[PDB]
């Protein structure tokens, strides 16, 4: 009666899909060419920031 | 179980056409544009 409960929640996240930010993979290709990182890895990037 | 697969594969068919199309609507408007700036090289090239 005087111990507070504490209750748990939970979400699961995964890096965004190829067409959330086709819009900033577009700013990456257009301001560095033909060095510009692939979308498969501006996704592990995104989710490592 | 059979209800089951079908609920997932249903949110994943989903979740598919809906990014596939914010990915076309947007790609068409990354080339809508690379069609005007490369029109304006394409003035500066017949002005000189």
Same mark, same amino acid.
């Given at each position: &009666?005087?111990?507070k409960?504490?209750?748990?929640?939970?979400?699961?996240?995964?890096? #965004?899909? +190829?067409?959330?930010? &086709?819009?900033?993979?577009?700013?990456?290709?257009?301001?560095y060419?033909?060095?510009? #990182?692939? +979308?498969?890895?501006?996704?592990?990037?995104?989710?490592?920031? | 179980?059979?209800?089951?697969?079908?609920?997932?594969?249903?949110?994943?068919?989903?979740?598919?056409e809906?990014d596939?199309?914010?990915?076309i609507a947007?790609?068409?408007?990354?080339?809508?544009?690379?069609?005007?700036?490369q029109?304006?090289?394409?003035?500066?090239?017949?002005?000189?």
């Amino acid at each position: &009666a005087v111990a507070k409960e504490k209750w748990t929640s939970t979400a699961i996240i995964t890096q #965004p899909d +190829v067409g959330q930010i &086709a819009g900033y993979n577009n700013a990456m290709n257009v301001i560095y060419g033909q060095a510009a #990182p692939k +979308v498969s890895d501006l996704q592990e990037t995104l989710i490592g920031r | 179980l059979a209800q089951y697969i079908q609920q997932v594969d249903d949110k994943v068919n989903q979740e598919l056409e809906k990014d596939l199309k914010d990915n076309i609507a947007l790609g068409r408007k990354n080339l809508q544009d690379s069609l005007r700036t490369q029109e304006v090289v394409a003035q500066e090239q017949k002005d000189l």
